[PDB]
Design a binder for these strands. Sequence first.
RNA 1: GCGCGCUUAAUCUGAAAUCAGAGCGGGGGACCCAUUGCACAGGGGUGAAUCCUUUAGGUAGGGCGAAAGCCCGAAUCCGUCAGCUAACCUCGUAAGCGCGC
Length: 90
Amino acid sequence: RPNHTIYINNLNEKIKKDELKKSLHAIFSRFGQILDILVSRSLKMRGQAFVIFKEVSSATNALRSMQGFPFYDKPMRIQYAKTDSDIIAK
RNA sequence: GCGCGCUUAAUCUGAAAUCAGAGCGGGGGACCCAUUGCACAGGGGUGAAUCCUUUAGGUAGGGCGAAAGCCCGAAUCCGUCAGCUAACCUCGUAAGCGCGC
Ligand SMILES: Nc1ncnc2c1ncn2[C@@H]1O[C@@H]2COP(=O)(O)O[C@H]3[C@@H](O)[C@H](n4cnc5c(N)ncnc54)O[C@@H]3COP(=O)(O)O[C@H]2[C@H]1O
Ligand SMILES: Nc1ncnc2c1ncn2[C@@H]1O[C@@H]2COP(=O)(O)O[C@H]3[C@@H](O)[C@H](n4cnc5c(N)ncnc54)O[C@@H]3COP(=O)(O)O[C@H]2[C@H]1O
Ligand SMILES: [Mg+2]
Ligand SMILES: [Mg+2]
Ligand SMILES: [Mg+2]
Ligand SMILES: [Mg+2]
Ligand SMILES: [Mg+2]
């Protein structure tokens, strides 16, 4: 179900948070203004990221356009976040 | 208090003691392997002490014992955090009882 925030998984877990967040911003900022990027390397949350766009249209185009993209030698897997981000609800 | 036996990683050596060694342990922590995970109590550690039913029984598991059998099946701590893991870093060495003089 379409959301302001997109959920990406199947990401290379060896890549550190700063570099990962930097690369994600680099790649997704062209689709529109990005509100934020949440990345965690914990055991449960590693290999995943949440990209929160200012506009939902950006999220949709980004998902449709970047689906399966070779990123750090692994094809990105992109779906929509199950729940709205704190930033949008507020 | 002391003698030797018990659980335990809980012992031994410095006149006594975490203040220090040795011994014996716990945790953190790469390559490789494993993990596909919906974020903003949870997760995890030591330990045999985990689990289902109406305060209780049973139970995975565990202790003593030559085997019969008798028991235990607690407590607690890190604080949103930890897989395996070599190097390297860090900590613990409390306590409760059974026999006899
Ligand atoms: N690690 C463990 N895992 C699971 N259960 C455990 C356990 N450690 C102990 N238990 C159980 O709980 C009781 C605790 O006894 P405790 O050691 O306080 O007191 C014990 C012990 O201090 C002493 N004792 C037992 N066996 C001994 C022996 N062979 N020699 C000298 N003393 C002994 O007499 C008491 C008799 O205890 P008993 O064996 O009937 O009962 C024990 C035991 O059955
Ligand atoms: N991987 C992990 N994930 C999440 N939390 C973790 C963890 N590892 C340890 N912890 C937590 O932090 C404390 C670790 O203390 P420490 O580093 O001194 O590591 C140990 C050790 O110094 C000592 N210890 C415990 N069991 C031991 C054993 N069997 N042998 C030797 N030392 C032991 O006491 C501490 C453990 O008990 P404490 O009550 O201090 O509680 C633990 C526990 O609550
Ligand atoms: Mg262990
Ligand atoms: Mg049994
Ligand atoms: Mg024994
Ligand atoms: Mg570890
Ligand atoms: Mg790790």
